[PDB]
């Protein structure tokens, strides 16, 4: 359990959607991060993959603001402390807003994968995963925005999937966190995008998996990495 408390871009903090504060507030602040109703700090499991919930987490609505990013710039996402138990991949996607991200129909966003990290080492099952890399980085993840994509407004969908329960049908725990970015620079690619509700299926080989046994490979779920 947890969520993104803060985002660092070009030497300032953009405060995240504080799901354990702003839903109790009823005149909460304008932020670059999407609001959610996920006040339990929990997840979208396999029962929700073909529901709107998977796109930017449960009952999610677009952030009011958008952060500019320098060409090939870094986005740093700071999480609440991530439990070692919650072993699994860290995956990042962009979807174009084609306009102000604050007014998009989330059910219409088409995501391309810009980065993925899975099982790093399996010397001691269940092993070292992207999630353990995230813990070792003091619960922060650094995304580099590609220089080769068309500039304009996009949603960054940033996700940990915990696999500690994933042996069981619908046991995997997806923690998607969305923010609004204004990508800048000279790129022109419009990558093939995948609907939120076509990212994952509850029987994917990297979703329905016993991590506690020796693994020879791990298939990072979702569509193919853009480069
Ligand atoms: C994270 O920072 C704290 C101090 O703020 C430090 O004590 C901790 O051990 C650091 N990093 C890791 C990888 O544990
Ligand atoms: Cu949890």
Residue numbers in the entry: 1 to 227
What did the publication describing this PDB structure actually write?
Lytic polysaccharide monooxygenases [LPMOs, reviewed in Tandrup et al., Vu & Ngo, Wang et al. and Eijsink et al.] were discovered just over 10 years ago and are metalloenzymes containing a type II Cu centre. A Cu2+ ion is coordinated by two histidines in a motif known as the histidine brace (His-brace), where the N-terminal His is often Nɛ2-methyl­ated in LPMOs of fungal origin and coordinates Cu using both the N-terminal nitro­gen and the Nδ1 atom. LPMOs cleave the glycosidic bond, producing both oxidized (C1 and/or C4) and non-oxidized chain ends. Here we have monitored the Cu-site geometry in two AA9 LPMOs, one from Lentinus similis (LsAA9_A) and one from Thermoascus auranti­acus (TaAA9_A), as the active-site Cu is photoreduced in the X-ray beam.
